[PDB]
Design a protein around this ligand. Sequence first.
Ligand SMILES: NC1CCN(Cc2ccn3ncnc(Oc4ccc(NC(=O)NC(=O)Cc5ccc(F)cc5)cc4F)c23)CC1
Length: 290
Amino acid sequence: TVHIDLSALNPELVQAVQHVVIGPSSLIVHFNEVIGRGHFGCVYHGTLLDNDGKKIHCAVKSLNRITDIGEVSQFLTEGIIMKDFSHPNVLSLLGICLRSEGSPLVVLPYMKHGDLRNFIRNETHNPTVKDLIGFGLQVAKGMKFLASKKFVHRDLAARNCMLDEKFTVKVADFLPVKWMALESLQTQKFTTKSDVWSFGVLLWELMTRGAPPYPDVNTFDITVYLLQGRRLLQPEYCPDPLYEVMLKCWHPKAEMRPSFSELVSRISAIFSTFIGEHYVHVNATYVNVK
Ligand SMILES: NC1CCN(Cc2ccn3ncnc(Oc4ccc(NC(=O)NC(=O)Cc5ccc(F)cc5)cc4F)c23)CC1
Protein backbone atom coordinates (compact mmCIF):
# COMPACT_ATOMS: atom_id res chain seq x y z
CA THR A 1 0.00 0.00 0.00
CA VAL A 2 1.98 2.98 -1.29
CA HIS A 3 0.57 6.50 -1.22
CA ILE A 4 1.38 7.19 -4.88
CA ASP A 5 -0.83 6.86 -7.96
CA LEU A 6 1.16 4.12 -9.70
CA SER A 7 -1.32 2.98 -12.35
CA ALA A 8 -0.79 6.42 -13.87
CA LEU A 9 2.49 4.91 -15.07
CA ASN A 10 2.71 3.74 -18.67
CA PRO A 11 -0.08 1.22 -19.31
CA GLU A 12 0.63 0.33 -22.94
CA LEU A 13 4.26 0.57 -21.86
CA VAL A 14 5.11 -1.05 -18.52
CA GLN A 15 2.21 -3.51 -18.57
CA ALA A 16 4.73 -6.29 -19.21
CA VAL A 17 5.66 -6.00 -15.53
CA GLN A 18 2.75 -8.33 -14.80
CA HIS A 19 3.58 -11.30 -17.03
CA VAL A 20 6.93 -11.20 -15.21
CA VAL A 21 5.75 -10.58 -11.64
CA ILE A 22 6.30 -13.30 -9.03
CA GLY A 23 3.93 -13.01 -6.05
CA PRO A 24 5.49 -12.41 -2.60
CA SER A 25 4.08 -15.86 -1.82
CA SER A 26 7.47 -17.39 -2.67
CA LEU A 27 10.22 -14.81 -2.11
CA ILE A 28 12.07 -14.25 1.18
CA VAL A 29 14.15 -11.08 1.59
CA HIS A 30 16.92 -10.59 4.17
CA PHE A 31 17.01 -6.83 4.84
CA ASN A 32 19.60 -7.60 7.52
CA GLU A 33 22.11 -8.91 4.96
CA VAL A 34 23.23 -6.11 2.65
CA ILE A 35 25.48 -7.23 -0.21
CA GLY A 36 26.02 -3.64 -1.29
CA ARG A 37 24.23 -0.39 -2.13
CA GLY A 38 25.84 0.93 -5.31
CA HIS A 39 24.34 4.41 -5.14
CA PHE A 40 20.73 4.43 -6.34
CA GLY A 41 19.40 1.43 -4.43
CA CYS A 42 20.08 -1.16 -1.75
CA VAL A 43 20.90 -4.76 -2.67
CA TYR A 44 20.39 -7.60 -0.20
CA HIS A 45 20.61 -11.39 0.00
CA GLY A 46 17.42 -13.18 -1.03
CA THR A 47 15.84 -16.59 -1.47
CA LEU A 48 13.35 -17.87 -4.04
CA LEU A 49 10.95 -20.77 -3.47
CA ASP A 50 10.86 -22.06 -7.05
CA ASN A 51 7.39 -23.52 -7.56
CA ASP A 52 6.71 -25.88 -4.66
CA GLY A 53 10.16 -26.89 -3.42
CA LYS A 54 13.28 -25.63 -5.20
CA LYS A 55 14.78 -22.81 -3.12
CA ILE A 56 17.34 -20.56 -4.81
CA HIS A 57 19.73 -17.81 -3.75
CA CYS A 58 19.47 -14.37 -5.36
CA ALA A 59 20.08 -10.62 -5.11
CA VAL A 60 17.07 -8.37 -4.43
CA LYS A 61 17.24 -4.85 -5.87
CA SER A 62 15.27 -2.02 -4.20
CA LEU A 63 15.13 1.80 -4.42
CA ASN A 64 15.07 4.80 -2.05
CA ARG A 65 11.41 5.77 -1.71
CA ILE A 66 9.16 8.65 -2.72
CA THR A 67 10.86 10.81 -5.35
CA ASP A 68 7.67 10.42 -7.37
CA ILE A 69 6.28 8.03 -9.97
CA GLY A 70 8.83 9.04 -12.62
CA GLU A 71 11.69 7.23 -10.90
CA VAL A 72 9.45 4.22 -10.21
CA SER A 73 9.03 3.66 -13.94
CA GLN A 74 12.78 4.18 -14.30
CA PHE A 75 13.57 1.35 -11.90
CA LEU A 76 10.85 -0.76 -13.51
CA THR A 77 11.35 0.05 -17.20
CA GLU A 78 14.93 -1.05 -16.61
CA GLY A 79 14.31 -4.34 -14.79
CA ILE A 80 11.99 -5.06 -17.69
CA ILE A 81 14.88 -4.22 -20.01
CA MET A 82 16.57 -7.39 -18.78
CA LYS A 83 13.42 -9.48 -19.17
CA ASP A 84 14.32 -10.37 -22.77
CA PHE A 85 18.02 -10.92 -21.98
CA SER A 86 18.03 -14.72 -22.29
CA HIS A 87 21.73 -15.53 -22.64
CA PRO A 88 24.16 -17.37 -20.34
CA ASN A 89 26.57 -14.41 -20.45
CA VAL A 90 23.98 -11.71 -19.76
CA LEU A 91 22.68 -10.90 -16.26
CA SER A 92 19.01 -11.87 -16.22
CA LEU A 93 15.89 -10.96 -14.27
CA LEU A 94 14.27 -13.62 -12.11
CA GLY A 95 11.14 -11.50 -11.73
CA ILE A 96 9.52 -8.58 -9.96
CA CYS A 97 7.28 -9.14 -6.94
CA LEU A 98 5.17 -6.24 -5.67
CA ARG A 99 4.02 -5.23 -2.20
CA SER A 100 3.63 -1.57 -3.23
CA GLU A 101 4.48 -0.41 0.31
CA GLY A 102 7.23 2.08 -0.59
CA SER A 103 9.86 0.29 -2.68
CA PRO A 104 9.41 -2.24 -5.51
CA LEU A 105 12.03 -4.96 -5.88
CA VAL A 106 13.83 -6.59 -8.80
CA VAL A 107 15.07 -10.17 -8.33
CA LEU A 108 18.45 -11.09 -9.82
CA PRO A 109 20.44 -14.33 -9.59
CA TYR A 110 23.08 -14.04 -6.88
CA MET A 111 26.65 -13.71 -8.21
CA LYS A 112 28.91 -15.44 -5.71
CA HIS A 113 32.16 -13.86 -6.90
CA GLY A 114 30.81 -10.33 -7.39
CA ASP A 115 32.26 -8.20 -10.17
CA LEU A 116 35.01 -9.23 -12.59
CA ARG A 117 37.23 -6.30 -11.55
CA ASN A 118 37.35 -7.01 -7.83
CA PHE A 119 37.64 -10.73 -8.58
CA ILE A 120 40.73 -10.35 -10.78
CA ARG A 121 42.32 -7.73 -8.54
CA ASN A 122 42.11 -10.20 -5.67
CA GLU A 123 45.63 -11.28 -4.69
CA THR A 124 44.38 -14.59 -3.22
CA HIS A 125 43.17 -15.54 -6.73
CA ASN A 126 45.54 -17.15 -9.27
CA PRO A 127 44.20 -16.67 -12.81
CA THR A 128 46.20 -17.95 -15.75
CA VAL A 129 46.32 -16.25 -19.14
CA LYS A 130 43.66 -18.83 -20.21
CA ASP A 131 41.25 -17.90 -17.40
CA LEU A 132 41.50 -14.17 -18.09
CA ILE A 133 41.13 -14.71 -21.82
CA GLY A 134 38.17 -16.95 -20.98
CA PHE A 135 36.44 -14.25 -18.98
CA GLY A 136 36.98 -11.93 -21.95
CA LEU A 137 35.59 -14.55 -24.30
CA GLN A 138 32.42 -14.81 -22.16
CA VAL A 139 32.03 -11.05 -22.22
CA ALA A 140 32.25 -10.98 -26.02
CA LYS A 141 29.60 -13.75 -26.22
CA GLY A 142 27.16 -11.74 -24.11
CA MET A 143 27.90 -8.57 -26.07
CA LYS A 144 27.43 -10.53 -29.26
CA PHE A 145 24.01 -11.41 -27.89
CA LEU A 146 23.20 -7.84 -26.87
CA ALA A 147 24.31 -6.38 -30.21
CA SER A 148 21.93 -8.84 -31.95
CA LYS A 149 19.09 -7.33 -29.92
CA LYS A 150 20.36 -3.88 -30.98
CA PHE A 151 21.08 -3.07 -27.33
CA VAL A 152 23.88 -0.52 -26.81
CA HIS A 153 25.42 -1.01 -23.40
CA ARG A 154 27.12 2.40 -23.12
CA ASP A 155 29.04 1.36 -20.04
CA LEU A 156 30.93 -1.88 -20.61
CA ALA A 157 33.76 -2.34 -18.09
CA ALA A 158 35.08 -5.11 -15.83
CA ARG A 159 33.25 -3.50 -12.87
CA ASN A 160 29.92 -4.06 -14.66
CA CYS A 161 30.49 -7.74 -15.36
CA MET A 162 29.37 -10.20 -12.69
CA LEU A 163 30.88 -13.60 -11.89
CA ASP A 164 28.90 -16.58 -10.50
CA GLU A 165 29.78 -19.85 -8.75
CA LYS A 166 30.56 -21.68 -12.00
CA PHE A 167 32.83 -18.80 -13.03
CA THR A 168 30.32 -17.75 -15.69
CA VAL A 169 30.51 -14.05 -16.55
CA LYS A 170 27.27 -12.09 -16.78
CA VAL A 171 27.56 -8.76 -18.55
CA ALA A 172 25.54 -6.26 -16.55
CA ASP A 173 25.16 -2.62 -15.54
CA PHE A 174 25.47 -1.40 -11.96
CA LEU A 175 30.63 9.39 -17.79
CA PRO A 176 33.35 6.67 -17.91
CA VAL A 177 35.66 8.59 -20.26
CA LYS A 178 38.56 6.10 -20.01
CA TRP A 179 36.40 3.34 -21.58
CA MET A 180 34.88 5.65 -24.20
CA ALA A 181 35.57 5.67 -27.92
CA LEU A 182 37.12 8.75 -29.46
CA GLU A 183 33.98 9.61 -31.45
CA SER A 184 31.80 9.23 -28.29
CA LEU A 185 34.12 11.51 -26.35
CA GLN A 186 33.70 14.12 -29.08
CA THR A 187 30.05 13.74 -30.14
CA GLN A 188 28.54 11.93 -27.11
CA LYS A 189 27.14 9.38 -29.60
CA PHE A 190 27.14 5.72 -28.47
CA THR A 191 26.90 2.73 -30.80
CA THR A 192 27.75 -0.95 -30.77
CA LYS A 193 31.12 -0.04 -32.31
CA SER A 194 31.63 2.25 -29.33
CA ASP A 195 31.00 -0.75 -27.04
CA VAL A 196 33.64 -2.67 -28.96
CA TRP A 197 36.09 0.09 -27.97
CA SER A 198 35.04 -0.29 -24.32
CA PHE A 199 35.43 -4.06 -24.70
CA GLY A 200 39.00 -3.49 -25.84
CA VAL A 201 39.65 -1.50 -22.65
CA LEU A 202 37.91 -4.25 -20.65
CA LEU A 203 40.34 -6.86 -22.09
CA TRP A 204 43.20 -4.63 -20.95
CA GLU A 205 41.67 -4.51 -17.42
CA LEU A 206 41.51 -8.32 -17.54
CA MET A 207 45.12 -8.86 -18.63
CA THR A 208 46.38 -6.28 -16.10
CA ARG A 209 44.22 -7.92 -13.46
CA GLY A 210 42.17 -4.76 -12.83
CA ALA A 211 44.67 -1.93 -13.13
CA PRO A 212 42.97 1.39 -13.81
CA PRO A 213 43.32 2.58 -17.44
CA TYR A 214 45.60 5.57 -18.11
CA PRO A 215 46.52 6.34 -14.47
CA ASP A 216 48.49 9.45 -15.45
CA VAL A 217 45.78 11.07 -17.60
CA ASN A 218 43.81 14.16 -16.51
CA THR A 219 40.45 12.37 -16.96
CA PHE A 220 38.70 13.77 -18.79
CA ASP A 221 41.41 15.20 -21.08
CA ILE A 222 41.69 11.72 -22.51
CA THR A 223 40.64 13.00 -25.94
CA VAL A 224 43.77 15.14 -26.29
CA TYR A 225 45.87 12.24 -25.00
CA LEU A 226 44.49 9.74 -27.52
CA LEU A 227 44.69 12.27 -30.36
CA GLN A 228 48.41 12.57 -29.67
CA GLY A 229 48.40 9.03 -31.11
CA ARG A 230 48.32 6.87 -27.97
CA ARG A 231 46.62 3.67 -26.84
CA LEU A 232 46.95 1.65 -23.64
CA LEU A 233 50.21 -0.31 -23.53
CA GLN A 234 50.33 -4.11 -23.85
CA PRO A 235 50.15 -5.68 -20.37
CA GLU A 236 53.15 -7.87 -19.49
CA TYR A 237 51.12 -11.11 -19.61
CA CYS A 238 48.99 -10.19 -22.60
CA PRO A 239 49.61 -12.36 -25.63
CA ASP A 240 50.51 -10.47 -28.80
CA PRO A 241 47.52 -11.80 -30.73
CA LEU A 242 45.27 -10.48 -27.97
CA TYR A 243 46.93 -7.06 -27.97
CA GLU A 244 46.41 -7.02 -31.73
CA VAL A 245 42.66 -7.54 -31.08
CA MET A 246 42.71 -4.76 -28.49
CA LEU A 247 44.28 -2.51 -31.11
CA LYS A 248 41.42 -3.42 -33.48
CA CYS A 249 38.79 -2.59 -30.88
CA TRP A 250 40.34 0.85 -30.61
CA HIS A 251 40.43 1.52 -34.34
CA PRO A 252 39.99 5.27 -35.12
CA LYS A 253 37.24 4.47 -37.63
CA ALA A 254 34.38 2.90 -35.65
CA GLU A 255 33.14 1.07 -38.78
CA MET A 256 36.57 -0.52 -39.08
CA ARG A 257 36.28 -2.10 -35.62
CA PRO A 258 35.52 -5.84 -35.48
CA SER A 259 31.99 -6.90 -34.60
CA PHE A 260 31.39 -8.90 -31.43
CA SER A 261 30.82 -12.03 -33.57
CA GLU A 262 34.28 -11.60 -34.99
CA LEU A 263 35.60 -10.92 -31.47
CA VAL A 264 34.09 -14.16 -30.11
CA SER A 265 35.59 -15.97 -33.09
CA ARG A 266 39.06 -14.43 -32.80
CA ILE A 267 39.20 -14.74 -29.03
CA SER A 268 37.89 -18.30 -28.95
CA ALA A 269 40.84 -19.24 -31.18
CA ILE A 270 43.41 -17.44 -29.04
CA PHE A 271 41.83 -18.95 -25.91
CA SER A 272 42.03 -22.45 -27.42
CA THR A 273 45.83 -22.28 -27.68
CA PHE A 274 46.46 -21.91 -23.93
CA ILE A 275 46.46 -24.80 -21.44
CA GLY A 276 46.49 -22.96 -18.11
CA GLU A 277 50.20 -22.97 -17.36
CA HIS A 278 50.98 -19.23 -17.71
CA TYR A 279 50.10 -17.48 -14.46
CA VAL A 280 49.28 -13.78 -14.54
CA HIS A 281 50.83 -11.63 -11.83
CA VAL A 282 50.08 -8.08 -10.73
CA ASN A 283 52.14 -5.20 -12.11
CA ALA A 284 54.28 -3.47 -9.46
CA THR A 285 53.65 -0.12 -11.19
CA TYR A 286 49.83 -0.48 -11.19
CA VAL A 287 49.46 -1.69 -7.60
CA ASN A 288 47.55 0.58 -5.20
CA VAL A 289 46.99 2.93 -8.14
CA LYS A 290 43.47 4.45 -8.19
N1 LIG B 1 30.49 -3.36 -8.56
C1 LIG B 1 29.32 -3.77 -7.75
C2 LIG B 1 29.69 -4.03 -6.28
C3 LIG B 1 28.51 -4.68 -5.54
N2 LIG B 1 27.90 -5.84 -6.26
C4 LIG B 1 26.63 -6.24 -5.65
C5 LIG B 1 26.33 -7.69 -5.90
C6 LIG B 1 27.04 -8.81 -5.29
C7 LIG B 1 26.43 -9.97 -5.70
N3 LIG B 1 25.43 -9.65 -6.56
N4 LIG B 1 24.64 -10.51 -7.21
C8 LIG B 1 23.76 -9.98 -7.99
N5 LIG B 1 23.55 -8.65 -8.19
C9 LIG B 1 24.33 -7.86 -7.57
O1 LIG B 1 24.29 -6.50 -7.68
C10 LIG B 1 23.88 -6.09 -8.94
C11 LIG B 1 24.68 -6.21 -10.10
C12 LIG B 1 24.15 -5.78 -11.34
C13 LIG B 1 22.84 -5.24 -11.38
N6 LIG B 1 22.26 -4.80 -12.59
C14 LIG B 1 21.02 -4.32 -12.73
O2 LIG B 1 20.22 -4.03 -11.87
N7 LIG B 1 20.61 -4.13 -13.97
C15 LIG B 1 21.35 -4.49 -15.05
O3 LIG B 1 22.43 -5.07 -14.92
C16 LIG B 1 20.72 -4.04 -16.32
C17 LIG B 1 21.54 -4.49 -17.43
C18 LIG B 1 21.64 -5.86 -17.76
C19 LIG B 1 22.43 -6.29 -18.83
C20 LIG B 1 23.10 -5.29 -19.52
F1 LIG B 1 23.86 -5.61 -20.54
C21 LIG B 1 23.03 -3.96 -19.22
C22 LIG B 1 22.25 -3.52 -18.14
C23 LIG B 1 22.11 -5.14 -10.20
C24 LIG B 1 22.61 -5.56 -9.00
F2 LIG B 1 21.86 -5.45 -7.90
C25 LIG B 1 25.35 -8.30 -6.69
C26 LIG B 1 27.57 -5.50 -7.66
C27 LIG B 1 28.79 -5.02 -8.41
